[PDB]
Amino acid sequence: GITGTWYNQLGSTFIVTAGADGALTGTYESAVGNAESRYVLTGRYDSAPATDGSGTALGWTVAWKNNYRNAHSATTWSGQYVGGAEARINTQWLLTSGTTEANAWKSTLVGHDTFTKVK
Amino acid sequence: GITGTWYNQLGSTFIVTAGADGALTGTYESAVGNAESRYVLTGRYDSAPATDGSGTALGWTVAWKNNYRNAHSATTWSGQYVGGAEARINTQWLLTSGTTEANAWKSTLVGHDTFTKVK
Amino acid sequence: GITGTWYNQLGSTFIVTAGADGALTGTYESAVESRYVLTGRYDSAPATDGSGTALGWTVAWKNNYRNAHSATTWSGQYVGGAEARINTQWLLTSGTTEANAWKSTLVGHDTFTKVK
Amino acid sequence: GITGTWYNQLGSTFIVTAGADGALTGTYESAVGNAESRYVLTGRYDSAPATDGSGTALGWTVAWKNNYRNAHSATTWSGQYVGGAEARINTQWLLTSGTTEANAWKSTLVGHDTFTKVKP
Ligand SMILES: O=C(O)CCCC[C@@H]1[Se]C[C@@H]2NC(=O)N[C@@H]21
Ligand SMILES: O=C(O)CCCC[C@@H]1[Se]C[C@@H]2NC(=O)N[C@@H]21
Ligand SMILES: O=C(O)CCCC[C@@H]1[Se]C[C@@H]2NC(=O)N[C@@H]21
Ligand SMILES: O=C(O)CCCC[C@@H]1[Se]C[C@@H]2NC(=O)N[C@@H]21
């Protein structure tokens, strides 16, 4: 279900494996921002979700440092997987940059990403 | 400086190891919510932060399922670690519960936690 | 371009008047009677480089018929053109006791359009 | 207890009047960001809050344009007033800047401000 390759509305690529233990592991490649190529992600998901039609809660983190570039920032996505004919992961995210203490008020962006397995 | 035990303002306990590769691994024990005992956490941090006084960006996820309870929800914390004698991890968080599609509008809580080395 | 009736994807409606001073006034008709006062502000002199027009408004969920002891603010931007939109993120805070304040605020997003 | 002069943890000044109709009016002066002097605010608050010890929900908006400066941005604060012993307004806020469509993903900052009546 969750395991596979997903794309968000920006064209970013989220390759994830959902482990039986509730673990999420994989790579994220952002189409935007101070990022290039793949970054490691790790996360957790509800491996025993409700059976009443509710989505599956999940979250994951990317710290935007790889072998090529370091943005000194990290994003967490929090959301739920909705299965079915048109599988989607609906997320909201927080991106925090490292700042000085005086600039901490503007450290964190918020947004929302929707992932499907298409394009 | 990140590795060790941290406590937030609500009385929750965050036990974490910061790996050399940027991995965060540990356990979270929540003082509030549909939670009981320890939960696995995983996350990522900037393992090569700026040397200009900026904090160290980081994030982690807890899915609120363990051997004792399943809240069908997951929280991600996004923030930065700030060193010194009064070291802190300042975070904002998103808590998404699994919902049906009709209730997705109320799926996600937002808040902020500050973690310190002493409590 | 802001003044008029807008519809979200959830069947809510709001009618707003954008005053020359930057004021937003109108009524929000929810879906998830149900009309509530809305007030807000918008940038009355936006950039002319294709940037959106920043704006925000608040609705306190009390009227003559019910009171949910809560308030939503929407923060976003108006984007003009053929498919005009107001893209928003919102925060809904409910009145809680201090012990429950950690769970007082929901966050989401809404997109409003001039059609349907 | 909402009406008065409030200051947040940054030293910003929030001057507000709560109208009997649920209206919030006043001025906001930010200690940080692309802002100078006072800006108009408007908002709403629950004028018949619960009597069980719960706070009073409220929210307000500032568009960061005044006679001196225009940041092409607007902030909304959503929060609750908590009386008793030491009056406080605890908020979370969203600051949206006007952006191109390509830059809309980075349009919105989020944070939290706590206000008390204690001058810096
Ligand atoms: O610019 C930076 O600091 C690092 C790049 C972050 C890109 C952000 Se993550 C939330 C949003 N979703 C996405 O795919 N890319 C953007
Ligand atoms: O109630 C649930 O769904 C699981 C428990 C959630 C606890 C939340 Se995580 C954000 C906040 N910080 C904390 O330590 N506990 C609360
Ligand atoms: O349940 C309540 O508190 C009263 C109705 C709240 C409606 C919320 Se405002 C954010 C979201 N957008 C919308 O149109 N309706 C929901
Ligand atoms: O920089 C801009 O775009 C306009 C100024 C925004 C200042 C932000 Se509003 C949230 C935070 N609280 C405060 O008092 N000032 C800052």
Author numbering:
A (entry chain A), B (entry chain B): 16 to 134
C (entry chain D): 16 to 47, 51 to 134
D (entry chain C): 16 to 135
Verbatim from the authors:
LCLS was operated at energies not previously available, delivering the 12.8 keV X-rays necessary for the work. The coMESH was compatible with the moderately viscous mother liquor composition of 24% PEG 1,500 and 20% glycerol; however, it has increased background, and the associated fluctuations in the background level added to the challenging nature of the data. The measured <ΔF>/<F> was ∼1% at 2 Å resolution. In addition to the weak <ΔF>/<F> for the system, no alpha helices were present in the molecule, making the density modification steps challenging and also rendering solutions using automated pipelines ineffective. These challenges necessitated the use of over 300,000 indexed patterns to achieve the successful phasing of the structure. For these reasons, demonstrating that the data for such a challenging system could be used for successful de novo structure determination indicates a good possibility for general applicability of Se-SAD de novo phasing at LCLS.
The method of serial femtosecond crystallography (SFX) has pushed the frontiers of protein crystallography at X-ray FELs through the use of smaller crystals than typically used with conventional sources and the use of the unique time resolution afforded by X-ray FELs131415. Extending the Se-SAD phasing ‘magic bullet' of structural biology to SFX experiments promises to provide a routine method for de novo phasing at X-rays FELs.
